[PDB]
């Protein structure tokens with residue numbers, strides 16, 4: 001689609017068998033999801049943004065469906081105030097900024 | 100332009116006659132830039148990001164060039180890891196997210 005930015009660019013995702021709402025965020029290096037269980041191994045990570053840093057769990061090789069488009073990559077899980085799809089997965093669905 | 104997301108979407112902005120680098124961030128409602136002098140009065144605001152909330156100074160009706168496009172709108176000044184152009188000015192420059 002072509003998404004205008006008059007409102008927050010929220011889309012439905014599917015991750016870990018669960019349907020969720022998430023924010024498409026061109027400013028985020030990484031994808032970070034509110035607390036949930038994911039299979040496989042993880043390791044701890046600290047990531048920074050406005051407000052400072054949070055500790056998250058880093059799960060690699062996780063498949064997510066974003067607005068109908070399948071991608072795989074690293075997903076971080078931790079106390080983010082909103083689910084965020086960042087550049088590591090936006091590239092895989094061919095997202096661009098256009099003006 | 101069409102900007103892909105394999106790297107951070109950094110562009111040149113001009114504010115107050117000074118060139119700066121800023122991040123185009125579709126996950127940001129607002130534009131927040133690092134400490135600098137702006138003209139006029141300011142109002143208080145608190146904004147949230149992934150690490151919690153920060154206090155900023157809100158300046159309205161500020162002239163700012165973004166990647167060669169003119170905008171005139173609200174700029175928040177406060178502690179921020181990078182200068183962020185959010186949706187309030189991305190809409191002024193006609194930006195959309197496409198996939």
Ligand SMILES: CCC[C@@]1(CCc2ccccc2)CC(O)=C([C@H](CC)c2cccc(NS(=O)(=O)c3ccc(C(F)(F)F)cn3)c2)C(=O)O1
Pocket residue numbers: 023025027028029030031032047048049050051081082084086107122124126127128129131146147148149150180181183
């Ligand atoms: C101005 C607030 C912006 C935002 C708002 C989130 C939000 C939305 C709705 C409701 C509540 C909150 C969105 C955003 O991109 C970030 C930052 C980047 C500026 C962010 C988001 C996601 C992950 C990170 N960490 S990171 O390691 O992937 C990373 C670190 C640094 C930068 C850098 F470019 F900003 F420097 C980009 N990415 C940061 C953030 O902290 O909050």
Ligand SMILES: [Cl-]
Pocket residue numbers: 035036037
């Ligand atoms: Cl769960």
Ligand SMILES: [Cl-]
Pocket residue numbers: 072073074088089
């Ligand atoms: Cl990845």
Ligand SMILES: [Cl-]
Pocket residue numbers: 171172173187188
């Ligand atoms: Cl504005």
Ligand code: NA
Pocket residue numbers: 039040041059060061062
């Ligand atoms: Na894994």
